Design an enzyme around this catalytic site. Structure first.
Site, mmCIF file in Angstrom:
data_model
loop_
_atom_site.group_PDB
_atom_site.id
_atom_site.type_symbol
_atom_site.label_atom_id
_atom_site.label_comp_id
_atom_site.label_asym_id
_atom_site.label_seq_id
_atom_site.Cartn_x
_atom_site.Cartn_y
_atom_site.Cartn_z
ATOM 1 C CG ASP A 99 -46.477 11.979 -24.078
ATOM 2 O OD1 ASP A 99 -46.116 12.838 -24.741
ATOM 3 O OD2 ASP A 99 -46.442 11.453 -22.965
ATOM 4 N NE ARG A 100 -40.631 10.241 -32.010
ATOM 5 C CZ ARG A 100 -39.598 11.273 -31.713
ATOM 6 N NH1 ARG A 100 -39.590 11.999 -30.831
ATOM 7 N NH2 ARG A 100 -38.641 11.115 -32.786
ATOM 8 C CE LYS A 101 -43.691 15.299 -22.967
ATOM 9 N NZ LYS A 101 -44.205 13.912 -22.789
ATOM 10 C CG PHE A 102 -43.014 14.604 -33.298
ATOM 11 C CD1 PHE A 102 -42.137 13.852 -34.047
ATOM 12 C CD2 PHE A 102 -44.461 14.347 -33.169
ATOM 13 C CE1 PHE A 102 -42.686 12.646 -34.633
ATOM 14 C CE2 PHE A 102 -44.780 13.129 -33.523
ATOM 15 C CZ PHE A 102 -43.962 12.360 -34.493
#
Lengths: 251, 260
Positions: free
Chosen positions: A89-92
């Protein structure tokens, strides 16, 4: 009318998206654990305990103070053992050229161990082009943040509708959405080849039954109720049965 | 008419914001280097070479495969040697509880060594509270992404206006914006107590292959009313980065001096 997951397996255009449906059908689960524990050692432990009940394990690799270079391979071994996918869940949220390096490289080398990542659309569709460059040859999938569970957020309205159009222009790589109430989108959840996963699920918080059966999502993302339980395996089973029965009511 | 940077020092409500204006006037620079090189070893080398020319060094710590826990101290030593601030371009974009951890903890411990970070507003105003909780006691500052330089982005119109209003509610911590054309906003760049830093800067207009769009230093500072030019590939892909950085510094400073 909701198509069953088994009819959607053949619609999924990306190999990770197809695998996700296959796991859900095989294990009778639409449950994703948000594995928000303090250390990598606790993460691996809880992944092993709840593995039988989940289709996906969602991580925040950048919160773990004991990250080491073998973390990804150890988590991959647990995912293979229990047959679930790893979602970082890096939410680039950067420009296309930057996210290439944030995904493929650095210390975490997220591309090498995460089956699925997510991205905001705010920086424009070049973010998808940049993640796809190294993600698609590896067979990875991307979820777009079309809606969010937090107060006063801006992932609403025309922004959500733009996420749908980006996904459908990039469905070789975009497997679906993070969404909250896709039943209440103008066109509903939309093309069944794309999957919806919803955070904030708890028995603000919404119940598994509401999220799957009323709001038209496909996967419930559950953290605190499982993470904080005395017996996470027991509570994860309760959530699996609730989310799966909600799906069966339509299917 | 715009205020000289030295006349804005007294208006800054956060200590890192105040320091940024003070560095710009001390060194006669409004240049920020985006040090997006392949390794931390190269980052520290280029920060030492280009440090005299810059008010801020912008990092992406998560692209450096040789990152180790001594990175922050080594970069802070260079920042002290050459008098610049460190800006980690982490683009926080999660919910408040998670962003607190991603700022203070994990392997990077960004809060320990970055004077400035930035955040998107897309997840709602609570992201500011999440970062302020541990950043404000340490005197850190936050930039909000009100606009971006990438093609087709959604940080436009009512979204940009919302970022301005969120900043107004958090003057203790939010030092300003990542912005692109603040002169075009309804009331212009706005409160001069806040700073504007603009990515997407090269000596010639152009772009990259993944949606980046470039404007000139002079247009960014003089026409579009920003305060700081953020330059990455324009400098770091040069055979002589220090010399190219001096060209960008002079262009951005002269563009600002035209209005003083």
């Amino acid at each position: 009318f909701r198509l069953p997951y088994g009819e959607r397996v053949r619609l999924a255009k990306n190999p990770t998206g197809k695998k996700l449906f296959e796991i859900m059908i095989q294990k009778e689960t639409n449950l994703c654990l948000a594995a928000d524990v303090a250390t990598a050692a606790e993460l691996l432990d809880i992944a092993d305990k709840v593995g039988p009940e989940i289709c996906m394990l969602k991580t925040h690799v950048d919160i773990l103070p004991d990250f080491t270079p073998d973390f990804g391979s150890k988590l991959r071994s647990i995912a293979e053992k229990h047959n679930f996918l790893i979602f970082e869940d890096r939410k680039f949220a950067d420009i296309g050229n930057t996210v290439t390096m944030q995904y493929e490289g650095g210390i975490f080398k997220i591309l090498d161990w995460a089956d699925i990542v997510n991205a905001h659309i705010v920086s424009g569709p070049g973010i998808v082009d940049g993640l796809k460059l190294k993600g698609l040859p590896r067979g990875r999938g991307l979820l777009l943040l079309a809606e969010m569970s937090s107060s006063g957020n801006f992932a609403k309205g025309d922004y959500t509708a733009a996420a749908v159009k980006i996904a459908e222009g990039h469905s070789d790589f975009v497997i679906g959405f993070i969404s909250v109430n896709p039943a209440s989108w103008p066109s509903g959840p939309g093309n069944p080849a794309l999957i919806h996963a919803t955070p904030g699920v708890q028995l603000q918080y919404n119940t598994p039954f509401s999220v799957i059966s009323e709001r038209g999502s496909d996967i419930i993302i559950v953290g605190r109720g499982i993470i904080k339980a005395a017996n996470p395996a027991e509570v994860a089973r309760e959530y699996r049965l609730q989310g799966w029965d909600a799906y069966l009511l339509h299917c």
